[PDB]
Design a protein around this ligand. Sequence first.
Ligand code: B12
Length: 161
Amino acid sequence: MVKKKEPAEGWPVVSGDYIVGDPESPVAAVTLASHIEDIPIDAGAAIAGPCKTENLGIEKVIANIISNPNIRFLVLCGSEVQGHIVGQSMKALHKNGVDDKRKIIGAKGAIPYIENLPEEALERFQKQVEIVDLIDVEDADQIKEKVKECIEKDPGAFEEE
Ligand code: B12
């Protein structure tokens, strides 16, 4: 009975390191430095993978989320990537956006620049999903429960006015 739309053709469009799950699940999971991509998928996520860079890696994540309107949650889990600091950089990008040199405002990551996505693609990212901070948590029971919680709170597919 929840509202679902069809994702872009050949989704996920952009090559990367991830596991695709249910394309209609509302939840995406970035595992960061950790190797736990399976745990969110077996709790019924749409897509889960590591992300180790605070620029190109982040751009690939966003491009592959916005192309599926069913996704309304982005879990950030697993150990933080030392120096790159991808987790905290992404939180900052969601909340603050980018400055006019395309630097992510507030990000502690060493080279937090989004060179390749346009502005409209970020605004969409900020409106489409909400962020769920489980950074430096690898506990399975925890990650599973948060993913099932999001599924229970599925607002359905996104659509701009
Ligand atoms: C080249 C490189 C950087 C480069 C610059 C490149 C850059 N972009 O900033 C430089 C040399 C500057 C660098 C420096 C060091 N690095 Co470095 N670096 C790398 C390397 C090779 C990057 C990997 C890469 O280019 N990946 C391409 C992108 C696309 O990969 P990705 O970020 O993971 O993105 C993935 C996701 O987007 C996913 N994906 C795609 N779509 C979707 C959708 C969804 C929903 C999801 C979930 C996922 C997903 O697919 C992508 C993979 O193809 C890695 C090695 C590695 N094992 O990955 C180390 C790595 C990131 N280095 C890291 C470290 C430690 C550093 C340093 C901090 C080390 C030091 N003390 O000097 C520094 C300094 C940081 C800094 N920037 O100043 C470590 C992290 C260790 C840790 N876990 O704590 C790594 C893993 C190497 C290692 N094993 O030691 N680094």
